[PDB]
């Protein structure tokens, strides 16, 4: 079993190393998104 | 069946509005009027044995 | 009634309780359809091992953890797709294996929270996360190697 | 409640079995963490003063 196909390269980027967050909503199915809902504010603590 | 509020995720109950039967949430103003037939069958187990023995 | 605010059936893959009228995929087929069947870009979420097979480059040390925070930009490894569906990640001298993570069905949004100013910052919704990858060391090869 | 049901399980008979507990919870007005904590504290017994 040789590596027949898809010898994909892997790059690394540190431009957004400290600014990248992952938000997951446990109660919202992936089909329905918050794209159309107008947001008003976001409070955060660094 | 069990249905949950898209807003907060609490359980939805069935009540009556001023025009139609609607699903409603007990903790937020979310509602949903019923348009067409909605059904939830269960198909309970039937007594299949003839019970002849001996 | 509004078609995009219907009540949700509990099974997140089958929320279509009312209508107007999934087989478990594998990484090789995943990437194969991601590139051959379609050319659209995709956002993936892969979990790397705790320590990468490297050394902190002049990071002031100790055999400590070598994470992505220490490595530099550029090509860091190759992704190999062998026959019979084996999916490896050659990250230098060693090769890890990449498998499917838990099939998430809830919404996962990859966003960028950039505090450009100490008083005002930007949230940038980069995209949606659909599939999760898990990378693990091929312990059998590391053991039979030495 | 949806998160609780997700944690319990997504099989149909699981929801059928767990429905009465949700109904009993909804009969009371317990909907926040504070309300449930207050209920439990009411259901608490002091260890001999
Ligand atoms: Zn609600």
Polypeptide structure, described:
This is part of a larger assembly, with chains A (46 residues), B (54 residues), C (146 residues) and D (49 residues). Chain A is mainly β and 46 residues long. Chain A contains no helices and two strands. Chain A is flat, with a radius of gyration of 18 Å. Chain A starts with a strand and ends in a 17-residue tail after the last strand. Chain B has 54 residues and is mainly beta. A three-stranded antiparallel beta sheet of chain B has the order 2-3-4, with no helix packed on it. Chain C has 146 residues and is mainly β. In chain C, 12% of the residues lie in helices and 32% in strands. In chain C, the strands form two sheets. Chain C has a five-stranded mixed beta sheet with strand order 2-8-5-4-3, with no helix packed on it. A two-stranded antiparallel ribbon of chain C has the order 6-7. Chain D has helices spanning 2-8, 12-27, 33-42. Zinc ion is lined by residues 5, 7-8, 10, 25, 27-28, 30 of chain B.
Topology:
The structure is cut from a larger assembly and holds chains A (46 residues), B (54 residues), C (146 residues) and D (49 residues).
Chain A: E1 5-12, E2 20-29
Chain B: E1 3-4, E2 12-16, E3 21-25, E4 31-33
Chain C: E1 8-9, H1 27-37, E2 44-47, E3 74-81, E4 87-90, E5 95-100, E6 106-114, E7 122-128, E8 131-137, H2 139-145
Parallel strand pairs in C: 2-8
Antiparallel strand pairs in C: 3-4, 4-5, 5-8, 6-7
Bound molecules: zinc ion (ZN).
Residues 5, 7-8, 10, 25, 27-28, 30 of chain B line the site of zinc ion.
PDB class: transcription/dna/rna
Keywords: Elongation complex, transcription/DNA/RNA, TRANSCRIPTION-DNA-RNA complex
Entry title: Human RNA Polymerase III de novo transcribing complex 13 (TC13)
Percent range for β-strand residues of chain D: under 5%
Radius of gyration of chain D: 14 Å
String of helices and strands of chain D: HHH
> What is the number of helical segments of chain C per DSSP (H or I, 4+ residues)?
2
Estimated share of beta-strand residues of chain C? 25-35%
Secondary-structure element pattern of chain C, one letter each: EHEEEEEEEH
The portion of residues assigned to helices of chain D is 55-70%
Radius of gyration of chain C: 20 Å
Strand order within the widest beta sheet of chain C: 2-8-5-4-3
The count of β-strands of chain D is 0
Query: How many helix segments of chain D?
Result: 3
What percent of the residues of chain C sit in helical stretches (DSSP H or I)?
10-25%
Assembly type of the chains comes to part of a larger assembly
Protein name (chain A): DNA-directed RNA polymerase III subunit RPC5
Subcellular location (chain A): Nucleus
Organism (chain A): Homo sapiens
Zinc finger (C4-type) (chain B): 5-28
């Amino acid at each position: 079993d040789d590596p027949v196909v898809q010898e994909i390269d892997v790059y690394l980027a540190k431009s957004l190393a400290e600014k990248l967050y992952l938000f997951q909503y446990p109660v919202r199915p992936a089909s329905m998104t918050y794209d159309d809902i107008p947001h008003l504010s976001a409070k955060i603590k660094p | 069946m069990l249905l949950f509020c898209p807003g907060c995720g609490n359980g939805l109950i069935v009540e009556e509005g001023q025009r139609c039967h609607r699903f409603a949430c007990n903790t937020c103003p979310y509602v949903h009027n019923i348009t067409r037939k909605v059904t939830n069958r269960k198909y309970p187990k039937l007594k299949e044995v003839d019970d002849v023995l001996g | 009634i509004i078609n995009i605010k219907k009540e949700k059936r509990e099974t997140d893959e089958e929320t279509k309780q009312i209508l107007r009228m999934l087989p478990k995929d594998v990484s090789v087929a995943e990437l194969l359809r991601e590139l051959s069947l379609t050319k659209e870009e995709e956002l993936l979420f892969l979990q790397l091992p705790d320590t990468l097979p490297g050394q902190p480059p002049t990071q002031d040390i100790a055999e400590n953890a070598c994470t992505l925070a220490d490595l530099t930009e550029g090509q860091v490894g190759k992704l190999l797709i062998r026959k019979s569906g084996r999916v490896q990640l050659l990250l230098g001298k060693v090769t890890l294996d990449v498998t499917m993570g838990t099939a998430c069905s809830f919404l996962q949004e990859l966003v960028s929270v950039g505090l450009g100013d100490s008083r005002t910052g930007e949230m940038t919704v980069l995209g949606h996360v659909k599939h999760k990858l898990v990378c693990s060391p091929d312990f059998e090869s590391l053991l039979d190697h030495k | 409640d949806q998160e609780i049901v997700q944690m319990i399980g997504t099989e149909e008979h699981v929801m059928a079995a767990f429905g009465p507990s949700l109904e009993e919870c909804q009969k009371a007005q317990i909907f926040t963490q504070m309300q449930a904590l207050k209920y439990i504290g009411n259901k608490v017994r002091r260890q001999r003063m």
